[PDB]
Scaffold this active site. Structure first.
Site, PDB file in Angstrom:
ATOM      1  N   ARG A  10     -24.341  32.865 -38.643  1.00 18.00           N
ATOM      2  CA  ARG A  10     -25.601  32.943 -39.404  1.00 18.00           C
ATOM      3  C   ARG A  10     -25.549  34.054 -40.475  1.00 18.00           C
ATOM      4  O   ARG A  10     -25.571  33.793 -41.671  1.00 18.00           O
ATOM      5  CB  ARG A  10     -26.665  33.068 -38.312  1.00 18.00           C
ATOM      6  CG  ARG A  10     -28.065  32.963 -38.863  1.00 18.00           C
ATOM      7  CD  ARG A  10     -28.518  34.414 -38.985  1.00 18.00           C
ATOM      8  NE  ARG A  10     -28.999  35.131 -37.763  1.00 18.00           N
ATOM      9  CZ  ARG A  10     -30.228  35.029 -37.251  1.00 18.00           C
ATOM     10  NH1 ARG A  10     -31.231  34.523 -37.942  1.00 18.00           N
ATOM     11  NH2 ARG A  10     -30.540  35.676 -36.134  1.00 18.00           N
ATOM     12  N   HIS A  12     -22.944  36.101 -41.443  1.00 18.06           N
ATOM     13  CA  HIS A  12     -21.662  36.411 -42.114  1.00 18.06           C
ATOM     14  C   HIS A  12     -20.956  35.242 -42.812  1.00 18.06           C
ATOM     15  O   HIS A  12     -20.580  35.388 -43.967  1.00 18.06           O
ATOM     16  CB  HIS A  12     -20.751  37.143 -41.117  1.00 18.06           C
ATOM     17  CG  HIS A  12     -21.368  38.466 -40.637  1.00 18.06           C
ATOM     18  ND1 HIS A  12     -21.731  39.464 -41.427  1.00 18.06           N
ATOM     19  CD2 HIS A  12     -21.941  38.681 -39.460  1.00 18.06           C
ATOM     20  CE1 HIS A  12     -22.530  40.288 -40.767  1.00 18.06           C
ATOM     21  NE2 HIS A  12     -22.665  39.794 -39.548  1.00 18.06           N
ATOM     22  N   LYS A  41     -34.014  41.540 -44.944  1.00 15.45           N
ATOM     23  CA  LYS A  41     -33.080  42.383 -44.201  1.00 15.45           C
ATOM     24  C   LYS A  41     -32.411  43.395 -45.160  1.00 15.45           C
ATOM     25  O   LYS A  41     -31.757  42.966 -46.124  1.00 15.45           O
ATOM     26  CB  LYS A  41     -32.123  41.418 -43.535  1.00 15.45           C
ATOM     27  CG  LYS A  41     -31.064  42.221 -42.820  1.00 15.45           C
ATOM     28  CD  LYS A  41     -30.110  41.317 -42.068  1.00 15.45           C
ATOM     29  CE  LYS A  41     -29.126  42.217 -41.335  1.00 15.45           C
ATOM     30  NZ  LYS A  41     -28.981  41.587 -40.032  1.00 15.45           N
ATOM     31  N   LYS A  66     -18.028  51.198 -35.149  1.00 17.83           N
ATOM     32  CA  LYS A  66     -18.685  52.334 -35.823  1.00 17.83           C
ATOM     33  C   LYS A  66     -19.446  53.324 -34.911  1.00 17.83           C
ATOM     34  O   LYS A  66     -19.559  54.511 -35.220  1.00 17.83           O
ATOM     35  CB  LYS A  66     -19.616  51.818 -36.923  1.00 17.83           C
ATOM     36  CG  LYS A  66     -20.706  50.902 -36.359  1.00 17.83           C
ATOM     37  CD  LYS A  66     -21.519  50.389 -37.531  1.00 17.83           C
ATOM     38  CE  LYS A  66     -22.562  49.418 -37.018  1.00 17.83           C
ATOM     39  NZ  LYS A  66     -23.271  48.961 -38.214  1.00 17.83           N
ATOM     40  N   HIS A 119     -20.278  39.908 -33.480  1.00 14.47           N
ATOM     41  CA  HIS A 119     -20.925  40.833 -34.427  1.00 14.47           C
ATOM     42  C   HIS A 119     -19.892  41.251 -35.478  1.00 14.47           C
ATOM     43  O   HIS A 119     -18.708  41.379 -35.190  1.00 14.47           O
ATOM     44  CB  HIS A 119     -21.402  42.119 -33.737  1.00 14.47           C
ATOM     45  CG  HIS A 119     -22.292  41.859 -32.523  1.00 14.47           C
ATOM     46  ND1 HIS A 119     -23.412  41.156 -32.501  1.00 14.47           N
ATOM     47  CD2 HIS A 119     -22.057  42.291 -31.288  1.00 14.47           C
ATOM     48  CE1 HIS A 119     -23.895  41.173 -31.261  1.00 14.47           C
ATOM     49  NE2 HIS A 119     -23.051  41.872 -30.511  1.00 14.47           N
ATOM     50  N   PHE A 120     -20.375  41.437 -36.700  1.00 17.89           N
ATOM     51  CA  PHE A 120     -19.581  42.087 -37.760  1.00 17.89           C
ATOM     52  C   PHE A 120     -20.034  43.540 -37.841  1.00 17.89           C
ATOM     53  O   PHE A 120     -21.207  43.863 -37.667  1.00 17.89           O
ATOM     54  CB  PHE A 120     -19.790  41.348 -39.064  1.00 17.89           C
ATOM     55  CG  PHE A 120     -18.912  41.831 -40.217  1.00 17.89           C
ATOM     56  CD1 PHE A 120     -19.328  42.921 -41.019  1.00 17.89           C
ATOM     57  CD2 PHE A 120     -17.640  41.232 -40.422  1.00 17.89           C
ATOM     58  CE1 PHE A 120     -18.460  43.451 -41.997  1.00 17.89           C
ATOM     59  CE2 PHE A 120     -16.789  41.742 -41.414  1.00 17.89           C
ATOM     60  CZ  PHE A 120     -17.199  42.852 -42.181  1.00 17.89           C
ATOM     61  N   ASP A 121     -19.056  44.403 -38.068  1.00 19.79           N
ATOM     62  CA  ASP A 121     -19.271  45.852 -38.008  1.00 19.79           C
ATOM     63  C   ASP A 121     -18.978  46.525 -39.364  1.00 19.79           C
ATOM     64  O   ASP A 121     -19.902  46.786 -40.128  1.00 19.79           O
ATOM     65  CB  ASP A 121     -18.382  46.371 -36.874  1.00 19.79           C
ATOM     66  CG  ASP A 121     -18.653  47.811 -36.452  1.00 19.79           C
ATOM     67  OD1 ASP A 121     -18.043  48.705 -37.080  1.00 19.79           O
ATOM     68  OD2 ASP A 121     -19.344  48.007 -35.428  1.00 19.79           O
TER      69      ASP A 121
END
Length: 124
Positions: A10, A12, A41, A66, A119-121
């Site tokens: 969704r 990325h 966002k 991170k 998740h993207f970091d």
């Protein structure tokens, strides 16, 4: 709900476009991907690859997220990423972004079965 792997997708994945073809790509793109459906966002990143390619990052190099968490992984090659950062006050529904097209190595937070980016970091 659009959980972990689906939420990565969704937020990325932008495989249809190989790159942010416009300095204002993020503005529109952010909207269609459900990200701005209620609120605009503040910060997000698109990733111009298939899910398969990004699953391939999860088994390259193990890294710290991170925050310090051990479940993030980096690709040995740079990926096409589009950082979407809010500019000139992102108000709903006219969400206003600054678009960055960069080819940087990515940190995806990965898990599950099959082992997938959830998740993207960070882009490095």
């Amino acid at each position: 709900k659009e959980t972990a792997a689906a939420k990565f997708e969704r937020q990325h994945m932008d495989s249809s476009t190989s790159a942010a073809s416009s300095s204002n790509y993020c503005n529109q793109m952010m909207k269609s991907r459900n990200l701005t459906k209620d609120r605009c966002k503040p910060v997000n990143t698109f990733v111009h690859e298939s899910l398969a390619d990004v699953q391939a990052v999860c088994s390259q190099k193990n890294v710290a997220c991170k925050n310090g968490q051990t479940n993030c992984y980096q690709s040995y090659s740079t990926m096409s990423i589009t950082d979407c950062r809010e500019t000139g006050s992102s108000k709903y529904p006219n969400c206003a972004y600054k678009t960055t097209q960069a080819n940087k190595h990515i940190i995806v937070a990965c898990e599950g079965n099959p082992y997938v980016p959830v998740h993207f970091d960070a882009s490095v």
